[PDB]
């Protein structure tokens, strides 16, 4: 399922993002002088199951979760440097039931254990000066599709 | 190369759309009550090398070419009915040197012999009430990439 | 990297099968009257890191591990029915660092926690009357490749 | 549809190879000291619709056709060098109705106009000391499948 997620907006998924689901996010650009850029996977109750905060200024990418009107939990971080590949950087999120797997363009995957047991009904995108294009292309799979040789 | 082509706009290709090039256009929607929708491949001189006019009202898809300030040549047509697949219809254009190959979601390909010998520097998208989403996702390949099993 | 793995034989991998690695096994056939068919991921020292025993007669698929000539550990099994899709059934294995994700044609993925801290140097295929073809096509990725829209 | 085509043998296709059809041939190896390696697309009556003779010693790749026990027609050749990429070289053939498009790992496509109005029922592979592996992996599509972004 193809979606066009605009900056400071969200897309309501036709089907819940649940175990086995795959979300491939791709940008048509990389604004080197962009600021903090966020992607959230929200439950129907608007809980933030997965919060991805890309902070080039802090040279870090932050992961977290929180209830609609609840506090954040302890953050999980990794260096921002050399993770994305210009000019079409991407982010891939896979739901493995008990945890999310996040892959950027380079390096090893990031594994984030779930903290809220619900599926996502929407994906939101936030930024004052996005590191990426608006909108971003988002292909959501109900399962991993057949792979090409390379 | 990923591009986001907005309705009534165009995208300047980083590389010329020439022989071997592949353009996969995908929409995140299908507005059943949409009107005539056009896609043009333009040379740097703004010549319309390939004109694709989707006319649901006329139940036809028209192909043509013309110089920046020149007249159209004789049209090439095919029925519009059962060509696209909702909700994410697509159009694929491949440059085979002496002719373009156009594939929609269903049916056989359409072959349009070239009438202007130039490569394309841009792709334009026109519609008052687009049949597709705005923008549309466009992946341009310099050559056919490795294929998946299915 | 493409390999052709013959029944009762094995392929020596060019690079170690480790975290991020993906093995897409595909058969050119499905022999209905076939018997127990096995696939093993072996370490350099020949430890069976991951054992997949497909048993049609017992209607189960058994997952296990064991050192070279050691004792098998507790078996992790699932029902065999409605897992493979003919005529080209497939098996996809992904190394996630602390566990393996195994995917068949139907159903949800299977997760098998690692038990031996070593990477796989080879993949073996055993069967007296294989459920699949000989050889089977095997594409091994060092990391998940770009995905098609569908 | 996946097939395993062995050297000096052939695969009988499930469906005819006709317009829109795509055959992605891939080898799990590249034998440098190999000799003339051939691939033929045969009609039901065994006419050689498309003959691809890869000759390293003559530094050319020869394209031709001929009825079952008939005379070969004029040869269409190109240089052999810098066409295949080891260790997994490939050959992709697409039927475009009035001609075939042949793609190797490097260079531009080769276009071969049809000479015998019949579809192919089988694909044969001949070689005394093959440049490729035995078998070679062959995925045949009834039409171009969705493409990955890269
Ligand atoms: C920033 C955005 O677009 N989304 C929200 C969101 O922002 C906060 C989350 O990203 C959160 C993830 O754990 O981190 C917060 O920053 C924390 C620092 O990482 C931490 O070192 C420090 O101890 O505490 C701060 C604040 O909790 C994000 O907060 C925002 O950015 C920071 C730099 C600061 O400017 C703060 O005032 C901002 O709120 O969530 C907040 C509300 O929690 C807003 O809704 C953002 O728009
Ligand atoms: C419509 C659009 O978005 N692009 C341009 C473009 O429109 C014309 C082309 O699509 C052209 C392709 O051959 O067909 C024209 O319609 C022709 C009919 O197909 C044909 O049966 C009849 O004999 O002649 C007409 C006009 O040449 C398209 O013309 C437009 O749509 C038609 C239905 C009519 O409303 C006409 O007034 C419109 O111009 O090119 C034109 C200029 O040539 C405009 O720039 C459109 O915006
Ligand atoms: C074809 C192949 O590679 N088989 C090997 C392999 O077979 C054993 C493993 O698959 C092992 C994994 O847990 O299971 C063994 O069967 C067990 C049954 O699952 C369990 O219900 C029963 O209580 O105990 C047995 C023994 O541990 C497999 O053993 C072979 O198949 C079973 C069905 C039985 O016929 C037994 O006699 C066989 O040994 O590993 C063995 C060595 O352990 C051989 O190398 C097989 O060729
Ligand atoms: C391995 C294989 O499948 N080869 C077949 C096949 O070989 C002939 C075709 O490849 C044919 C395609 O045009 O070319 C023939 O060679 C020609 C040379 O290209 C041309 O320069 C020369 O002047 O004339 C020859 C003959 O037509 C292929 O013929 C075989 O290989 C050549 C190099 C030579 O050694 C000749 O004696 C061989 O027959 O088809 C033949 C039957 O025509 C056999 O079935 C091969 O096994």
């Amino acid at each position: 399922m193809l979606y066009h997620l605009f900056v400071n907006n969200q897309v309501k998924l036709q089907n819940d993002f649940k175990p086995e689901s795959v979300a491939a996010i791709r940008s048509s650009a990389f604004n080197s002088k962009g600021g903090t850029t966020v992607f959230n996977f929200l439950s129907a109750g608007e809980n933030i199951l997965l919060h991805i905060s890309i902070r080039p200024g802090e040279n870090v990418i932050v992961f977290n979760s929180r209830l609609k009107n609840g506090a954040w939990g302890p953050e999980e971080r990794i260096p921002y440097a050399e993770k994305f590949r210009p000019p079409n950087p991407s982010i891939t999120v896979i739901d493995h039931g008990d945890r999310f797997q996040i892959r950027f363009d380079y390096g090893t995957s990031i594994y984030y254990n779930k903290r809220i047991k619900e599926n996502a009904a929407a994906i939101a995108y936030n930024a004052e000066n996005s590191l990426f294009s608006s909108p971003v292309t988002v292909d959501v799979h109900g399962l991993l599709p057949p792979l090409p040789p390379a």
Side-chain angles (χ1 to χ4, degrees), chain A:
Chain A
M1 190 64 74
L2 172 65
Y3 298 93
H4 286 107
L5 173 55
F6 293 75
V7 69
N8 293 329
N9 283 285
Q10 57 165 50
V11 290
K12 187 176 184 176
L13 308 173
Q14 220 62 62
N15 293 140
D16 291 340
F17 197 70
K18 63 179 198 311
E20 296 300 313
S21 290
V22 177
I25 305 179
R26 302 188 290 126
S27 171
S28 60
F30 180 70
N31 314 304
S32 62
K33 296 190 173 181
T36 291
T37 304
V38 167
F39 285 94
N40 293 327
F41 284 67
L42 310 167
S43 64
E46 288 182 298
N47 288 316
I48 302 178
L49 314 171
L50 175 56
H51 175 68
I52 306 176
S53 177
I54 306 168
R55 313 179 181 179
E58 260 189 280
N59 184 51
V60 70
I61 298 172
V62 181
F63 302 83
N64 215 321
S65 301
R66 76 177 180 71
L67 300 178
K68 183 182 182 181
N69 276 303
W72 290 113
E75 311 179 324
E76 277 177 57
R77 306 179 161 217
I78 62 172
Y80 160 75
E82 53 189 52
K83 281 296 189 307
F84 304 99
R85 176 202 312 148
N88 296 168
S90 71
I91 300 170
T92 297
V93 180
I94 302 183
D95 187 335
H96 292 292
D98 54 3
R99 71 181 182 185
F100 292 105
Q101 169 189 14
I102 303 83
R103 271 203 64 68
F104 300 104
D105 298 301
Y106 305 115
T108 51
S109 301
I110 292 69
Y111 292 85
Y112 185 81
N113 292 165
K114 296 192 175 189
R115 302 182 181 177
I116 302 172
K117 64 180 300 179
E118 305 180 305
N119 296 313
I123 307 181
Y125 174 24
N126 298 313
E128 282 180 56
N129 185 60
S130 187
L131 214 59
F132 307 137
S133 68
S134 180
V136 285
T137 284
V138 190
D139 284 288
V140 186
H141 307 262
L143 72 182
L144 220 213
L147 311 178

